[PDB]
Amino acid sequence: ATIGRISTGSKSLDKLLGGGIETQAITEVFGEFGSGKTQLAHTLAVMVQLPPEEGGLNGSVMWIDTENTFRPERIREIAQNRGLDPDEVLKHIAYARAFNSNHQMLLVQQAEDMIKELLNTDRPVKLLIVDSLTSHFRSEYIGRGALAERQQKLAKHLADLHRLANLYDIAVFVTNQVQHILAHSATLRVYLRKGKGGKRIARLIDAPHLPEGEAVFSITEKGIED
Amino acid sequence: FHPA
C-alpha cells in the first residue's frame, strides 16, 4: 500500500514533515512538560477524520492514554471550530486507559481486533495514539539494571506498534516527556518546545532527507495554526 | 476500548 499523509493544520509543520504525519510509520514527539505534545495528539485525532482533499484520511482513531490527559472537551472544541459535528468526531475515537506498562503492551494486541473490524468500512483506523509512550516504563523500570531491561521491553512494544502501522496502513503517533544517550526505534523523532510568546517550535532530529529548519505554530481553538 |  502507498503511504498516506495526515495534515496537522500547521503549514510549517506540514512542510517540515513532507506533507503531514505518515502512515506505515511511528512518529515520536518529545519535549518537556507543557511543550504541547498532547495538544498535537488531540489535533491529529480530529484532522485524520477529514476527507483526503482536506488533508485527512477519512479515518477512525484509537487512543491509549497513560496519564488521564485525553479531554473530550478539547476534541469537541477543535471539531466545532473546523465545521465538524463534535459528537460524530468523538464516536470515531476509540479510547482506552493503560493501567501500567504491561497492560499498555497488551492493549496493542487488543487494538488489532478493532483495526481488523473497521478495515473495509468507509472509516478504517488510520491513527493510533499512545500518550505517554514512556511514562509507565520510566516509573516501573528504574535503578541498577533497569536501563537494559527497559530498553528491551520498549523495543518489543515499539516492534508491535511498527507491525500495526505497516500491516494495516496506520499512522502511529506517540509522545515522550524529556527533561539523552538511549536508543530509539521510532521512524521519525520531532523535538517540540515552548518558546517566547507561548509559540511552539518543532525540529526534526536525525532526519537528513527532510527539509532543514523549524516549524512554528500557536495552540488555538482549531487545534494548531501558524 | 470504548467510543470517546
Coordinates of N, CA and C in Angstrom, one line a residue:
Chain A
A1 N 0.8 -1.2 0.0 CA 0.0 0.0 0.0 C 0.9 1.3 0.0
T2 N 0.5 2.3 -0.8 CA 1.1 3.6 -0.8 C 0.8 4.3 0.5
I3 N 1.7 5.0 1.0 CA 1.5 5.7 2.3 C 0.6 6.9 2.2
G4 N -0.1 7.2 3.3 CA -1.0 8.4 3.4 C -0.3 9.4 4.3
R5 N -0.8 10.7 4.2 CA -0.2 11.8 5.0 C -1.3 12.7 5.6
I6 N -1.3 12.7 6.9 CA -2.3 13.5 7.7 C -1.8 14.9 8.0
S7 N -2.5 15.9 7.5 CA -2.2 17.3 7.8 C -2.4 17.6 9.3
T8 N -1.5 18.4 9.8 CA -1.5 18.8 11.2 C -2.4 20.1 11.4
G9 N -2.6 20.8 10.4 CA -3.3 22.1 10.5 C -2.2 23.3 10.5
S10 N -1.0 22.9 10.8 CA 0.1 23.9 10.7 C 0.8 23.8 9.4
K11 N 0.9 24.9 8.6 CA 1.5 24.9 7.3 C 3.0 24.6 7.4
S12 N 3.7 25.2 8.4 CA 5.1 25.0 8.5 C 5.4 23.6 9.0
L13 N 4.6 23.1 9.9 CA 4.8 21.7 10.4 C 4.5 20.7 9.3
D14 N 3.5 20.9 8.5 CA 3.3 20.0 7.4 C 4.5 20.0 6.4
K15 N 5.0 21.2 6.1 CA 6.1 21.3 5.2 C 7.4 20.5 5.8
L16 N 7.6 20.8 7.0 CA 8.7 20.1 7.7 C 8.6 18.6 7.6
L17 N 7.4 18.1 7.7 CA 7.1 16.6 7.7 C 7.0 16.0 6.3
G18 N 7.1 16.9 5.2 CA 7.0 16.4 3.9 C 5.6 16.2 3.4
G19 N 4.6 16.9 4.1 CA 3.2 16.8 3.7 C 2.3 16.6 4.9
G20 N 2.8 15.9 5.9 CA 2.0 15.6 7.1 C 2.5 14.3 7.8
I21 N 1.9 13.9 8.8 CA 2.2 12.7 9.5 C 2.0 11.4 8.6
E22 N 3.0 10.5 8.6 CA 2.9 9.4 7.6 C 2.2 8.1 8.2
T23 N 1.4 7.5 7.4 CA 1.0 6.1 7.8 C 2.2 5.2 7.5
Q24 N 2.1 3.9 8.0 CA 3.2 3.0 7.9 C 4.5 3.6 8.5
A25 N 4.3 4.3 9.6 CA 5.4 4.9 10.3 C 5.0 5.2 11.8
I26 N 6.0 5.2 12.7 CA 5.8 5.7 14.0 C 6.5 7.1 14.2
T27 N 5.7 8.1 14.5 CA 6.2 9.5 14.7 C 6.2 9.7 16.2
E28 N 7.4 10.0 16.8 CA 7.5 10.3 18.2 C 7.7 11.8 18.4
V29 N 6.8 12.4 19.1 CA 7.1 13.8 19.5 C 7.7 13.8 21.0
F30 N 8.7 14.5 21.2 CA 9.3 14.5 22.6 C 9.7 16.0 23.0
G31 N 9.7 16.2 24.3 CA 9.9 17.5 24.8 C 9.5 17.6 26.3
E32 N 9.7 18.8 26.8 CA 9.4 19.0 28.3 C 7.9 19.0 28.5
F33 N 7.6 18.9 29.8 CA 6.2 19.1 30.3 C 5.7 20.5 29.8
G34 N 4.5 20.5 29.2 CA 3.9 21.7 28.8 C 4.3 22.2 27.4
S35 N 5.0 21.4 26.6 CA 5.5 21.8 25.3 C 4.4 21.7 24.2
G36 N 3.4 21.0 24.5 CA 2.3 20.8 23.6 C 2.1 19.5 22.9
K37 N 2.7 18.4 23.4 CA 2.7 17.1 22.8 C 1.2 16.6 22.7
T38 N 0.5 16.7 23.8 CA -0.9 16.2 23.9 C -1.8 17.1 23.1
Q39 N -1.5 18.4 23.0 CA -2.3 19.3 22.1 C -2.2 18.8 20.6
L40 N -1.0 18.4 20.2 CA -0.8 17.8 18.9 C -1.5 16.5 18.7
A41 N -1.6 15.7 19.7 CA -2.4 14.4 19.6 C -3.9 14.7 19.5
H42 N -4.4 15.6 20.3 CA -5.8 16.0 20.1 C -6.1 16.5 18.7
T43 N -5.2 17.3 18.2 CA -5.4 18.0 16.9 C -5.5 16.9 15.8
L44 N -4.5 16.0 15.8 CA -4.4 14.9 14.8 C -5.7 14.0 14.9
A45 N -6.2 13.7 16.1 CA -7.4 12.9 16.3 C -8.6 13.4 15.6
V46 N -8.6 14.7 15.3 CA -9.7 15.4 14.5 C -9.3 15.4 13.1
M47 N -8.1 15.9 12.8 CA -7.6 16.1 11.4 C -7.7 14.9 10.5
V48 N -7.4 13.7 11.1 CA -7.4 12.4 10.3 C -8.8 12.1 9.9
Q49 N -9.8 12.6 10.5 CA -11.2 12.3 10.2 C -11.7 13.1 9.0
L50 N -11.0 14.1 8.6 CA -11.4 14.9 7.4 C -11.2 14.1 6.1
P51 N -11.9 14.5 5.1 CA -11.7 13.7 3.8 C -10.3 14.1 3.2
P52 N -9.8 13.2 2.3 CA -8.5 13.3 1.8 C -8.1 14.7 1.1
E53 N -9.1 15.3 0.4 CA -8.8 16.5 -0.2 C -8.6 17.7 0.7
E54 N -9.0 17.4 2.0 CA -8.8 18.5 3.0 C -7.7 18.1 4.0
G55 N -6.9 17.1 3.6 CA -5.7 16.7 4.4 C -5.9 15.6 5.4
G56 N -7.1 15.0 5.5 CA -7.2 13.8 6.3 C -7.2 12.5 5.6
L57 N -7.6 11.4 6.2 CA -7.7 10.1 5.6 C -9.0 9.5 5.7
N58 N -10.1 10.3 6.0 CA -11.4 9.7 6.3 C -11.3 8.6 7.3
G59 N -10.5 8.8 8.4 CA -10.2 7.7 9.2 C -10.7 7.7 10.6
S60 N -10.7 6.5 11.2 CA -11.1 6.3 12.6 C -9.8 6.4 13.5
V61 N -9.9 6.5 14.8 CA -8.8 6.7 15.7 C -8.9 5.7 16.9
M62 N -7.7 5.3 17.3 CA -7.6 4.6 18.6 C -6.6 5.3 19.5
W63 N -6.9 5.4 20.8 CA -6.1 6.2 21.7 C -5.9 5.5 23.0
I64 N -4.6 5.2 23.3 CA -4.1 4.6 24.5 C -3.6 5.7 25.4
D65 N -4.2 6.0 26.5 CA -3.9 7.1 27.5 C -3.3 6.5 28.7
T66 N -2.1 7.0 29.1 CA -1.4 6.6 30.3 C -1.4 7.6 31.5
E67 N -1.8 8.8 31.2 CA -1.7 9.9 32.2 C -3.1 10.6 32.4
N68 N -4.2 10.1 31.9 CA -5.5 10.6 32.1 C -5.6 12.1 31.5
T69 N -4.9 12.3 30.4 CA -4.8 13.6 29.7 C -5.7 13.8 28.5
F70 N -6.4 12.7 28.1 CA -7.4 12.9 27.0 C -8.6 13.7 27.5
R71 N -8.9 14.7 26.7 CA -10.0 15.6 27.0 C -11.1 15.6 25.9
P72 N -12.2 14.9 26.1 CA -13.3 15.0 25.1 C -13.7 16.5 24.8
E73 N -13.6 17.3 25.8 CA -13.9 18.7 25.7 C -13.0 19.4 24.6
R74 N -11.8 19.0 24.6 CA -10.8 19.6 23.7 C -11.1 19.1 22.2
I75 N -11.4 17.8 22.1 CA -11.9 17.3 20.8 C -13.1 18.0 20.3
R76 N -14.1 18.2 21.2 CA -15.3 19.0 20.9 C -15.0 20.4 20.3
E77 N -14.1 21.1 21.0 CA -13.7 22.5 20.6 C -13.1 22.5 19.2
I78 N -12.1 21.6 19.0 CA -11.4 21.5 17.7 C -12.4 21.2 16.6
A79 N -13.2 20.2 16.8 CA -14.2 19.7 15.8 C -15.2 20.9 15.4
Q80 N -15.8 21.5 16.4 CA -16.7 22.6 16.3 C -16.1 23.7 15.4
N81 N -14.9 24.1 15.7 CA -14.3 25.2 15.0 C -13.7 24.8 13.7
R82 N -13.8 23.6 13.3 CA -13.4 23.1 11.9 C -14.6 22.7 11.1
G83 N -15.8 23.0 11.5 CA -17.0 22.7 10.8 C -17.6 21.3 10.9
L84 N -17.1 20.6 11.9 CA -17.4 19.2 12.1 C -18.4 19.0 13.2
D85 N -19.2 17.9 13.2 CA -20.0 17.5 14.3 C -19.2 16.9 15.4
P86 N -19.2 17.6 16.6 CA -18.3 17.1 17.7 C -18.7 15.7 18.2
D87 N -20.0 15.4 18.2 CA -20.4 14.0 18.7 C -20.0 12.9 17.7
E88 N -20.1 13.2 16.4 CA -19.6 12.2 15.4 C -18.1 12.0 15.5
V89 N -17.4 13.1 15.6 CA -15.9 13.1 15.8 C -15.5 12.2 17.0
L90 N -16.2 12.4 18.1 CA -15.9 11.7 19.3 C -16.3 10.2 19.2
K91 N -17.4 9.9 18.4 CA -17.8 8.5 18.2 C -16.7 7.7 17.5
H92 N -15.9 8.3 16.7 CA -14.9 7.6 15.9 C -13.5 7.6 16.5
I93 N -13.4 8.0 17.8 CA -12.3 7.8 18.6 C -12.5 6.7 19.6
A94 N -11.8 5.6 19.5 CA -11.9 4.5 20.4 C -10.8 4.7 21.5
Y95 N -11.2 4.7 22.7 CA -10.4 5.1 23.9 C -10.2 4.1 24.9
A96 N -8.9 3.9 25.4 CA -8.6 3.0 26.5 C -7.5 3.6 27.4
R97 N -7.7 3.4 28.7 CA -6.6 3.8 29.6 C -5.8 2.6 30.0
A98 N -4.5 2.8 29.9 CA -3.5 1.7 30.3 C -3.1 1.9 31.7
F99 N -3.3 0.9 32.5 CA -3.1 0.9 34.0 C -1.6 0.9 34.4
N100 N -0.8 0.2 33.6 CA 0.7 0.0 33.8 C 1.3 -0.3 32.5
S101 N 2.6 -0.5 32.4 CA 3.3 -0.8 31.1 C 3.0 -2.1 30.5
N102 N 2.7 -3.1 31.4 CA 2.3 -4.4 30.9 C 0.9 -4.4 30.2
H103 N 0.0 -3.7 30.8 CA -1.3 -3.5 30.3 C -1.2 -2.7 29.0
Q104 N -0.4 -1.7 29.0 CA -0.1 -0.9 27.8 C 0.3 -1.8 26.6
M105 N 1.2 -2.7 26.9 CA 1.7 -3.6 25.9 C 0.6 -4.5 25.3
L106 N -0.2 -5.1 26.3 CA -1.4 -5.9 25.9 C -2.4 -5.2 25.0
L107 N -2.6 -3.9 25.4 CA -3.6 -3.1 24.6 C -3.3 -2.9 23.1
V108 N -2.0 -3.1 22.8 CA -1.7 -3.1 21.3 C -2.2 -4.3 20.6
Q109 N -2.2 -5.5 21.3 CA -2.8 -6.7 20.8 C -4.3 -6.5 20.7
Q110 N -4.9 -5.9 21.8 CA -6.3 -5.7 21.8 C -6.8 -4.8 20.6
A111 N -6.0 -3.7 20.3 CA -6.3 -2.8 19.3 C -6.5 -3.4 17.9
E112 N -5.7 -4.5 17.7 CA -5.7 -5.2 16.4 C -7.1 -5.7 16.1
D113 N -7.9 -6.1 17.1 CA -9.3 -6.6 16.8 C -10.2 -5.5 16.1
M114 N -10.2 -4.3 16.7 CA -11.0 -3.2 16.1 C -10.4 -2.8 14.7
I115 N -9.1 -2.8 14.6 CA -8.4 -2.5 13.3 C -8.9 -3.4 12.2
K116 N -8.9 -4.7 12.5 CA -9.4 -5.7 11.5 C -10.9 -5.5 11.2
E117 N -11.7 -5.2 12.2 CA -13.1 -5.0 12.0 C -13.4 -3.8 11.1
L118 N -12.7 -2.7 11.3 CA -13.1 -1.5 10.5 C -12.4 -1.4 9.2
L119 N -11.5 -2.4 8.9 CA -10.6 -2.3 7.8 C -11.3 -2.0 6.5
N120 N -12.4 -2.6 6.3 CA -13.2 -2.4 5.0 C -14.4 -1.6 5.1
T121 N -14.6 -0.8 6.2 CA -15.6 0.2 6.3 C -15.1 1.4 5.6
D122 N -16.0 2.5 5.6 CA -15.7 3.7 5.0 C -14.8 4.6 5.9
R123 N -14.6 4.1 7.1 CA -13.7 4.8 8.0 C -12.8 3.8 8.8
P124 N -11.8 3.2 8.1 CA -10.9 2.3 8.7 C -10.0 3.1 9.7
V125 N -9.4 2.4 10.7 CA -8.5 3.0 11.6 C -7.3 3.6 10.8
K126 N -7.0 4.9 11.0 CA -5.9 5.5 10.3 C -4.9 6.1 11.2
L127 N -5.2 6.2 12.5 CA -4.4 6.9 13.5 C -4.4 6.1 14.9
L128 N -3.3 5.7 15.4 CA -3.2 5.1 16.7 C -2.3 6.0 17.6
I129 N -2.8 6.5 18.7 CA -2.1 7.4 19.6 C -1.7 6.6 20.9
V130 N -0.4 6.8 21.3 CA 0.0 6.3 22.6 C 0.6 7.5 23.4
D131 N -0.1 8.0 24.4 CA 0.2 9.2 25.1 C 0.0 8.9 26.6
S132 N 1.1 8.6 27.4 CA 2.5 8.7 27.0 C 3.1 7.4 26.7
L133 N 4.0 7.3 25.7 CA 4.7 6.1 25.4 C 5.5 5.5 26.5
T134 N 6.1 6.4 27.3 CA 7.2 6.1 28.2 C 7.0 6.3 29.6
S135 N 5.9 7.0 30.0 CA 5.7 7.3 31.5 C 5.7 6.1 32.4
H136 N 4.9 5.1 32.0 CA 4.8 3.9 32.8 C 6.2 3.1 32.9
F137 N 6.9 3.1 31.8 CA 8.2 2.4 31.7 C 9.2 3.1 32.6
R138 N 9.1 4.4 32.6 CA 10.0 5.2 33.5 C 9.8 5.0 34.9
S139 N 8.5 4.9 35.3 CA 8.1 4.7 36.7 C 8.5 3.3 37.2
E140 N 8.3 2.3 36.3 CA 8.4 0.9 36.7 C 9.8 0.3 36.6
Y141 N 10.5 0.6 35.6 CA 11.9 0.1 35.4 C 12.9 1.2 35.7
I142 N 13.4 1.1 36.9 CA 14.2 2.2 37.5 C 15.2 1.6 38.5
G143 N 16.4 2.2 38.4 CA 17.5 1.7 39.3 C 18.5 0.8 38.6
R144 N 19.5 0.3 39.3 CA 20.5 -0.5 38.7 C 20.0 -1.7 38.0
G145 N 20.4 -1.9 36.7 CA 19.8 -3.0 35.9 C 18.7 -2.6 35.0
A146 N 18.1 -1.4 35.3 CA 16.8 -1.0 34.6 C 17.1 -0.5 33.2
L147 N 18.2 0.1 32.9 CA 18.4 0.6 31.6 C 18.3 -0.5 30.5
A148 N 19.0 -1.6 30.7 CA 19.0 -2.7 29.7 C 17.6 -3.3 29.6
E149 N 16.9 -3.5 30.7 CA 15.6 -4.2 30.8 C 14.5 -3.3 30.1
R150 N 14.5 -2.0 30.5 CA 13.5 -1.1 30.0 C 13.7 -1.0 28.5
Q151 N 14.9 -0.8 28.0 CA 15.1 -0.7 26.6 C 14.7 -1.9 25.8
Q152 N 14.8 -3.1 26.4 CA 14.4 -4.3 25.7 C 12.8 -4.4 25.7
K153 N 12.2 -4.0 26.7 CA 10.7 -4.0 26.8 C 10.2 -3.0 25.8
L154 N 10.7 -1.8 25.8 CA 10.3 -0.7 24.9 C 10.5 -1.1 23.5
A155 N 11.7 -1.8 23.2 CA 11.9 -2.3 21.8 C 10.9 -3.2 21.3
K156 N 10.4 -4.1 22.2 CA 9.3 -5.0 21.8 C 8.0 -4.3 21.6
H157 N 7.7 -3.4 22.5 CA 6.5 -2.6 22.4 C 6.4 -1.8 21.1
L158 N 7.6 -1.2 20.7 CA 7.7 -0.4 19.5 C 7.6 -1.3 18.3
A159 N 8.2 -2.5 18.3 CA 8.1 -3.5 17.2 C 6.6 -3.9 17.0
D160 N 5.8 -4.1 18.1 CA 4.4 -4.4 18.0 C 3.7 -3.2 17.3
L161 N 4.0 -2.0 17.7 CA 3.4 -0.8 17.0 C 3.8 -0.7 15.6
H162 N 5.1 -0.9 15.3 CA 5.5 -0.9 13.9 C 4.7 -1.9 13.0
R163 N 4.5 -3.0 13.6 CA 3.7 -4.1 12.8 C 2.3 -3.6 12.5
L164 N 1.6 -3.0 13.5 CA 0.2 -2.5 13.2 C 0.3 -1.3 12.1
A165 N 1.3 -0.4 12.3 CA 1.4 0.7 11.3 C 1.6 0.1 9.9
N166 N 2.5 -0.8 9.8 CA 2.9 -1.3 8.5 C 1.9 -2.3 7.9
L167 N 1.3 -3.2 8.7 CA 0.4 -4.2 8.2 C -1.0 -3.6 7.8
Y168 N -1.4 -2.6 8.5 CA -2.7 -2.1 8.3 C -2.8 -0.6 7.8
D169 N -1.7 -0.1 7.4 CA -1.6 1.3 6.8 C -2.1 2.3 7.8
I170 N -1.5 2.4 9.0 CA -1.9 3.3 10.0 C -0.7 4.2 10.4
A171 N -1.1 5.5 10.7 CA -0.1 6.4 11.3 C -0.1 6.2 12.8
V172 N 1.1 5.8 13.4 CA 1.2 5.7 14.9 C 1.9 7.0 15.4
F173 N 1.3 7.6 16.3 CA 1.8 8.9 16.9 C 2.0 8.7 18.4
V174 N 3.2 8.9 18.9 CA 3.5 8.6 20.3 C 4.2 9.8 21.0
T175 N 4.0 10.0 22.3 CA 4.6 11.1 23.0 C 5.6 10.6 24.0
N176 N 6.6 11.5 24.3 CA 7.7 11.1 25.3 C 8.1 12.4 26.0
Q177 N 8.0 12.4 27.3 CA 8.4 13.6 28.1 C 9.9 13.5 28.5
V178 N 10.6 14.6 28.1 CA 12.1 14.6 28.3 C 12.5 15.9 29.1
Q179 N 13.3 15.8 30.1 CA 13.7 17.0 30.9 C 14.7 17.8 30.1
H180 N 20.2 11.5 27.7 CA 19.9 11.7 26.3 C 20.8 10.8 25.4
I181 N 21.2 9.6 25.8 CA 22.0 8.8 25.0 C 21.4 7.4 24.8
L182 N 20.1 7.3 25.1 CA 19.4 6.0 24.8 C 19.0 5.8 23.4
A183 N 18.9 4.6 22.9 CA 18.5 4.2 21.6 C 17.0 4.5 21.5
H184 N 16.5 4.8 20.3 CA 15.1 5.0 20.0 C 14.8 4.3 18.7
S185 N 13.6 3.7 18.5 CA 13.2 3.0 17.3 C 12.0 3.5 16.6
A186 N 11.6 4.7 17.0 CA 10.6 5.4 16.2 C 11.1 5.7 14.8
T187 N 10.2 5.8 13.8 CA 10.6 6.1 12.4 C 11.1 7.6 12.3
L188 N 10.4 8.5 12.9 CA 10.7 9.9 12.9 C 10.6 10.5 14.3
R189 N 11.6 11.3 14.7 CA 11.5 12.0 16.0 C 11.5 13.5 15.8
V190 N 10.5 14.1 16.5 CA 10.2 15.5 16.4 C 10.4 16.1 17.8
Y191 N 11.4 17.0 18.0 CA 11.6 17.8 19.2 C 10.7 19.0 19.3
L192 N 9.9 19.0 20.3 CA 8.9 20.2 20.5 C 9.3 21.0 21.7
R193 N 9.2 22.3 21.6 CA 9.4 23.1 22.8 C 8.5 24.4 22.8
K194 N 8.2 24.9 24.0 CA 7.5 26.1 24.1 C 8.5 27.3 24.2
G195 N 8.4 28.2 23.3 CA 9.3 29.4 23.3 C 8.6 30.7 23.6
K196 N 9.2 31.8 23.3 CA 8.7 33.1 23.7 C 7.3 33.4 23.1
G197 N 6.5 34.0 23.8 CA 5.1 34.3 23.4 C 4.2 33.1 23.4
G198 N 4.7 32.0 24.0 CA 4.0 30.8 24.0 C 3.9 30.1 22.7
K199 N 4.6 30.6 21.7 CA 4.7 29.9 20.4 C 5.3 28.6 20.6
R200 N 5.0 27.6 19.8 CA 5.6 26.3 19.9 C 6.5 26.0 18.7
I201 N 7.6 25.5 18.9 CA 8.7 25.3 17.9 C 9.0 23.8 17.7
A202 N 9.0 23.3 16.5 CA 9.3 21.9 16.2 C 10.5 21.7 15.3
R203 N 11.3 20.8 15.7 CA 12.5 20.5 14.9 C 12.7 18.9 14.7
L204 N 13.0 18.5 13.5 CA 13.3 17.1 13.3 C 14.7 16.7 13.8
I205 N 14.7 15.5 14.4 CA 16.0 15.0 14.9 C 16.5 13.8 14.1
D206 N 17.7 13.9 13.6 CA 18.3 12.9 12.8 C 17.5 12.5 11.6
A207 N 17.1 13.6 10.8 CA 16.3 13.4 9.6 C 16.9 14.1 8.4
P208 N 18.0 13.7 7.9 CA 18.8 14.4 6.8 C 18.0 14.7 5.5
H209 N 17.1 13.8 5.1 CA 16.5 14.0 3.8 C 15.2 14.8 3.9
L210 N 14.8 15.3 5.1 CA 13.7 16.1 5.2 C 14.1 17.6 5.3
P211 N 13.2 18.5 5.0 CA 13.6 20.0 4.9 C 14.3 20.5 6.2
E212 N 15.5 21.1 6.0 CA 16.1 21.8 7.1 C 15.3 23.0 7.6
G213 N 15.3 23.2 8.9 CA 14.6 24.3 9.5 C 13.7 23.9 10.7
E214 N 12.9 24.8 11.1 CA 12.0 24.6 12.2 C 10.6 25.1 11.9
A215 N 9.6 24.4 12.3 CA 8.2 24.8 12.2 C 7.8 25.6 13.5
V216 N 6.9 26.6 13.3 CA 6.5 27.4 14.4 C 5.0 27.6 14.3
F217 N 4.3 27.4 15.4 CA 2.8 27.5 15.4 C 2.2 27.9 16.8
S218 N 0.9 28.2 16.8 CA 0.2 28.5 18.0 C -0.8 27.4 18.3
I219 N -1.1 27.2 19.6 CA -2.2 26.4 20.0 C -3.5 27.3 20.0
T220 N -4.5 26.9 19.2 CA -5.7 27.7 19.0 C -7.0 26.8 19.2
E221 N -8.1 27.4 19.1 CA -9.4 26.7 19.1 C -9.6 25.7 18.0
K222 N -8.8 25.8 16.9 CA -8.8 24.9 15.8 C -7.8 23.8 15.9
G223 N -7.1 23.8 17.0 CA -6.0 22.8 17.2 C -4.7 23.5 17.2
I224 N -4.0 23.5 16.1 CA -2.8 24.4 15.9 C -2.9 25.1 14.6
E225 N -2.3 26.3 14.6 CA -2.3 27.2 13.4 C -1.0 28.1 13.4
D226 N -0.5 28.4 12.2 CA 0.7 29.2 12.1 C 0.4 30.7 12.3
Chain B
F1 N -11.3 -0.8 24.7 CA -11.6 0.4 24.0 C -13.1 0.7 24.0
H2 N -13.4 2.0 24.2 CA -14.8 2.4 24.1 C -14.9 3.8 23.3
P3 N -16.0 4.1 22.6 CA -16.1 5.4 22.0 C -16.0 6.6 23.0
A4 N -15.3 7.6 22.5 CA -14.9 8.8 23.3 C -16.0 9.7 23.8

